[PDB]
Amino acid sequence: FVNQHLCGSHLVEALYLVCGERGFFYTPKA
Amino acid sequence: FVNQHLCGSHLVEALYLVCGERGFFYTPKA
Amino acid sequence: FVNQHLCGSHLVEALYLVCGERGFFYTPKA
Amino acid sequence: FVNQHLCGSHLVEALYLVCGERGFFYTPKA
Amino acid sequence: FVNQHLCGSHLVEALYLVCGERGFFYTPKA
Amino acid sequence: FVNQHLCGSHLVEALYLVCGERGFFYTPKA
Amino acid sequence: GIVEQCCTSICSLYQLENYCN
Amino acid sequence: GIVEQCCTSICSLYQLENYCN
Amino acid sequence: GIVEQCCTSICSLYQLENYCN
Amino acid sequence: GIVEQCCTSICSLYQLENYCN
Amino acid sequence: GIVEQCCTSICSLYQLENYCN
Amino acid sequence: GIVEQCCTSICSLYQLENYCN
Ligand SMILES: [Zn+2]
Ligand SMILES: [Zn+2]
Numbered sequence A, B, C, D, E, F: 001f002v003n004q005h006l007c008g009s010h011l012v013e014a015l016y017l018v019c020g021e022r023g024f025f026y027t028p029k030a
Numbered sequence G, H, I, J, K, L: 001g002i003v004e005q006c007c008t009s010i011c012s013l014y015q016l017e018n019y020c021n
Helices: A009-022 B009-022 C010-023 D008-021 E009-022 F011-020 G002-008 G014-021 H002-008 H013-019 I002-008 I013-019 J002-008 J013-019 K002-008 K013-019 L003-010 L014-020
Strands: A023-026 B023-026 C024-026 D025-026 E025-026 F024-026
Touching: A009 A023, A009 B009, A009 B023, A009 D008, A009 F011, A009 K002, A009 K013, A023 D008, B009 B023, B009 C010, B009 G014, B023 G014, C010 C024, C010 D008, C010 D025, C010 I002, C010 I013, C024 D008, C024 G002, C024 I013, D008 D025, D008 E009, D008 H002, D008 H013, E009 E025, E009 F011, E009 L014, E025 F011, E025 L014, F011 F024, F011 J002, F011 K013, F024 J013, G002 G014, H002 H013, H002 L014, H013 I002, I002 I013, J002 J013, J013 L014, K002 K013, L003 L014
Parallel strands: none
Antiparallel strands: A023 B023, C024 D025, E025 F024
């Protein structure tokens, strides 16, 4: 795996890919 | 607004759009 | 619902989500 | 170019790619 | 067809659309 | 990491995330 | 849960707001 | 319409151009 | 217009509803 | 190939790495 | 946090795993 | 190359066809 520049909805798609049926929390600072 | 079939990554994009700065949880076990 | 920064194809995905089977027009200035 | 099955939001991304600056209408009732 | 500004994952989606079952190579410089 | 059903453009986004700077090939005939 | 409401069945943007933090 | 052509059936990028403004 | 506003500034899902059919 | 592994069946991110250049 | 880091800097899929349930 | 051009400049769907198999 390589480092990622992920902004906006692209970060949520990556979380979905990584976590799958395990689920995930999306929690931005402010 | 309209009722959608939203699945897989589409469901997570929808949560991002709707929740944004508040953040969200995606928990398909629940 | 929260305010949205939506550029490019991200704006069209949001329109699809909001309008659904109602359909929509995508009409950029210039 | 090739023939694709294009559905839901994928169809709208395809219209954005193909039409761009011209804009488009998505009217699934029609 | 119109000219495209395509960065990141948006370029890969366009390749998928253009090439389909023919497949494609995604080969960034560096 | 988890096991996903990944199809069509979703499979290509996954390859982009995983491969990034290395690039990738998408060859569904193979 | 969310999958059952929004993927098997159909759900509104208002129902989706139930999953905001 | 578009759904029938491009989702049930299969359609080309040229057919998609029919829906540009 | 909407395209311009949502990108150079900010816009709401309620503004986007103005573009449905 | 990839479709059979990752779309009909299920595949891991590690299997996806087999398709990096 | 993660949201901020992945966007203003860079992050890895292994860092993202910290956010699964 | 193509990746660089489409992002730092602009490119066409016909240029992208050069990358199909
Ligand atoms: Zn983007
Ligand atoms: Zn999809």
